[PDB]
Design an enzyme around this catalytic site. Structure first.
Site, PDB file in Angstrom:
ATOM      1  N   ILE A 106     -49.336 -12.693 -21.656  1.00 26.72           N
ATOM      2  CA  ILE A 106     -48.986 -13.805 -20.778  1.00 26.72           C
ATOM      3  C   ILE A 106     -49.277 -13.274 -19.380  1.00 26.72           C
ATOM      4  CG2 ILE A 106     -47.168 -15.314 -19.892  1.00 26.72           C
ATOM      5  CD1 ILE A 106     -47.965 -15.713 -22.852  1.00 26.72           C
ATOM      6  N   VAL A 155     -36.795 -26.856 -12.882  1.00 30.19           N
ATOM      7  CA  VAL A 155     -35.402 -27.105 -13.246  1.00 30.19           C
ATOM      8  C   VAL A 155     -35.201 -28.450 -13.947  1.00 30.19           C
ATOM      9  CG1 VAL A 155     -33.026 -26.920 -12.418  1.00 30.19           C
ATOM     10  CG2 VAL A 155     -34.876 -25.807 -11.158  1.00 30.19           C
ATOM     11  N   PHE A 211     -55.358 -11.592 -28.107  1.00 32.68           N
ATOM     12  CA  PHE A 211     -55.880 -10.335 -28.641  1.00 32.68           C
ATOM     13  C   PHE A 211     -55.607 -10.371 -30.146  1.00 32.68           C
ATOM     14  CE2 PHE A 211     -54.979  -8.994 -24.197  1.00 32.68           C
ATOM     15  CZ  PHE A 211     -56.185  -8.377 -23.874  1.00 32.68           C
TER      16      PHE A 211
HETATM   17  C1  LIG Z   1     -46.108 -12.978 -16.272  1.00 30.32           C
HETATM   18  C2  LIG Z   1     -45.298 -13.698 -15.040  1.00 30.32           C
HETATM   19  O1  LIG Z   1     -46.004 -14.800 -14.882  1.00 30.32           O
HETATM   20  S1  LIG Z   1     -44.058 -13.197 -14.289  1.00 30.32           S
HETATM   21  C3  LIG Z   1     -43.841 -14.550 -13.011  1.00 30.32           C
HETATM   22  C4  LIG Z   1     -43.182 -15.755 -13.718  1.00 30.32           C
HETATM   23  N1  LIG Z   1     -43.302 -16.857 -12.757  1.00 30.32           N
HETATM   24  C5  LIG Z   1     -42.751 -17.097 -11.583  1.00 30.32           C
HETATM   25  O2  LIG Z   1     -41.874 -16.316 -11.132  1.00 30.32           O
HETATM   26  C6  LIG Z   1     -43.265 -18.248 -10.761  1.00 30.32           C
HETATM   27  C7  LIG Z   1     -42.138 -19.029 -10.062  1.00 30.32           C
HETATM   28  N2  LIG Z   1     -41.195 -19.694 -10.989  1.00 30.32           N
HETATM   29  C8  LIG Z   1     -41.514 -20.776 -11.760  1.00 30.32           C
HETATM   30  O3  LIG Z   1     -42.637 -21.269 -11.749  1.00 30.32           O
HETATM   31  C9  LIG Z   1     -40.380 -21.329 -12.651  1.00 30.32           C
HETATM   32  O4  LIG Z   1     -39.121 -20.915 -12.116  1.00 30.32           O
HETATM   33  C10 LIG Z   1     -40.499 -20.972 -14.185  1.00 30.32           C
HETATM   34  C11 LIG Z   1     -41.905 -21.270 -14.774  1.00 30.32           C
HETATM   35  C12 LIG Z   1     -40.122 -19.463 -14.404  1.00 30.32           C
HETATM   36  C13 LIG Z   1     -39.468 -21.799 -14.906  1.00 30.32           C
HETATM   37  O5  LIG Z   1     -39.870 -23.240 -14.930  1.00 30.32           O
HETATM   38  P1  LIG Z   1     -38.821 -24.387 -14.907  1.00 30.32           P
HETATM   39  O6  LIG Z   1     -39.465 -25.668 -15.317  1.00 30.32           O
HETATM   40  O7  LIG Z   1     -38.060 -24.338 -13.651  1.00 30.32           O
HETATM   41  O8  LIG Z   1     -37.748 -23.936 -15.937  1.00 30.32           O
HETATM   42  P2  LIG Z   1     -36.884 -24.749 -17.049  1.00 30.32           P
HETATM   43  O9  LIG Z   1     -36.383 -25.970 -16.406  1.00 30.32           O
HETATM   44  O10 LIG Z   1     -37.504 -24.810 -18.428  1.00 30.32           O
HETATM   45  O11 LIG Z   1     -35.721 -23.672 -17.091  1.00 30.32           O
HETATM   46  C14 LIG Z   1     -35.776 -22.586 -18.033  1.00 30.32           C
HETATM   47  C15 LIG Z   1     -34.423 -21.967 -18.244  1.00 30.32           C
HETATM   48  O12 LIG Z   1     -34.400 -20.564 -17.885  1.00 30.32           O
HETATM   49  C16 LIG Z   1     -33.206 -20.208 -17.239  1.00 30.32           C
HETATM   50  N3  LIG Z   1     -33.352 -19.053 -16.417  1.00 30.32           N
HETATM   51  C17 LIG Z   1     -32.615 -17.895 -16.463  1.00 30.32           C
HETATM   52  N4  LIG Z   1     -32.967 -17.005 -15.578  1.00 30.32           N
HETATM   53  C18 LIG Z   1     -34.021 -17.602 -14.883  1.00 30.32           C
HETATM   54  C19 LIG Z   1     -34.865 -17.144 -13.784  1.00 30.32           C
HETATM   55  N5  LIG Z   1     -34.732 -15.931 -13.245  1.00 30.32           N
HETATM   56  N6  LIG Z   1     -35.789 -17.999 -13.329  1.00 30.32           N
HETATM   57  C20 LIG Z   1     -35.951 -19.214 -13.859  1.00 30.32           C
HETATM   58  N7  LIG Z   1     -35.234 -19.737 -14.901  1.00 30.32           N
HETATM   59  C21 LIG Z   1     -34.255 -18.865 -15.389  1.00 30.32           C
HETATM   60  C22 LIG Z   1     -32.833 -21.499 -16.501  1.00 30.32           C
HETATM   61  O13 LIG Z   1     -31.437 -21.465 -16.137  1.00 30.32           O
HETATM   62  C23 LIG Z   1     -33.251 -22.582 -17.521  1.00 30.32           C
HETATM   63  O14 LIG Z   1     -32.198 -22.744 -18.458  1.00 30.32           O
HETATM   64  P3  LIG Z   1     -31.197 -23.978 -18.483  1.00 30.32           P
HETATM   65  O15 LIG Z   1     -32.035 -25.205 -18.443  1.00 30.32           O
HETATM   66  O16 LIG Z   1     -30.410 -23.806 -19.689  1.00 30.32           O
HETATM   67  O17 LIG Z   1     -30.378 -23.768 -17.244  1.00 30.32           O
END
Ligand SMILES: CC(=O)SCCNC(=O)CCNC(=O)[C@H](O)C(C)(C)COP(=O)(O)OP(=O)(O)OC[C@H]1O[C@@H](n2cnc3c(N)ncnc32)[C@H](O)[C@@H]1OP(=O)(O)O
Length: 163
Positions: free
Chosen positions: A81, A92, A73
């Site tokens: 997002i 992870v 936008f």
């Molecule tokens: C607008 C929305 O889309 S809201 C919905 C968001 N999406 C989801 O819930 C879908 C399901 N989840 C996922 O696909 C994944 O868990 C994602 C995209 C959120 C994260 O992707 P990943 O590749 O696992 O994460 P990545 O390895 O970069 O980890 C990111 C960091 O965030 C941290 N973190 C803190 N709280 C959280 C949480 N609630 N969930 C996930 N990561 C978290 C992690 O500990 C990590 O940090 P670290 O490496 O220092 O420990």
């Protein structure tokens, strides 16, 4: 190839023109649906294929392993997002953060320094690590009716620092 690649894709008018991109969009739709089980599949498909939405796709060996669906936008000064996800077996490892950092660089280049999103409660921590906050600086009059609001989600904002 043999390595991960970032591609900003989407449907510009009709998704039949570029089959490679179409295959990736379907792949994204499936990954989003699988990692976002509470989201209607038809709903995800509708947005992923909407010409006004783009998706930053993370591809490894021709296969989609994650992505962020968003809507720019420019006049409002922010980007929404919509969907954010990484396939389970690739989580992870740092890809979720890698994806957001890439999205930030892309927007800094397009001079959009604000991200707005509705986070499910159990994902809030991910957004916080990426610099998002529950404190919203974009005025409500600027996003109301622009971004889509969701049930039981928390509006969060990321203020990008161009460095
Ligand atoms: C607008 C929305 O889309 S809201 C919905 C968001 N999406 C989801 O819930 C879908 C399901 N989840 C996922 O696909 C994944 O868990 C994602 C995209 C959120 C994260 O992707 P990943 O590749 O696992 O994460 P990545 O390895 O970069 O980890 C990111 C960091 O965030 C941290 N973190 C803190 N709280 C959280 C949480 N609630 N969930 C996930 N990561 C978290 C992690 O500990 C990590 O940090 P670290 O490496 O220092 O420990």
């Amino acid at each position: 190839s043999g390595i991960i690649e970032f591609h900003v894709i989407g449907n510009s008018l009709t998704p039949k023109a570029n089959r490679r991109v179409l295959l990736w969009l379907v792949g994204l739709q499936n990954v989003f649906s699988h990692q976002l089980p509470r989201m209607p599949k038809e709903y995800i498909a509708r947005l992923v294929f909407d010409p006004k939405h783009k998706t930053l796709a993370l591809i490894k060996d021709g296969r989609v392993i994650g992505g962020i669906c968003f809507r720019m936008f420019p006049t409002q000064g922010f980007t929404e997002i919509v969907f954010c996800a990484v396939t389970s077996n690739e989580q992870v490892k740092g890809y979720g953060t890698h994806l957001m950092n890439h999205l930030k660089e892309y927007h800094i280049k397009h001079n959009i320094l604000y991200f707005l999103t509705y986070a499910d409660e159990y994902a809030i921590g991910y957004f916080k690590k990426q610099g998002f906050s529950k404190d919203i600086k974009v005025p409500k009059s600027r996003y109301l009716g622009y971004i889509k609001d969701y049930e039981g989600a928390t509006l969060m904002e990321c203020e990008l620092n161009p460095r």
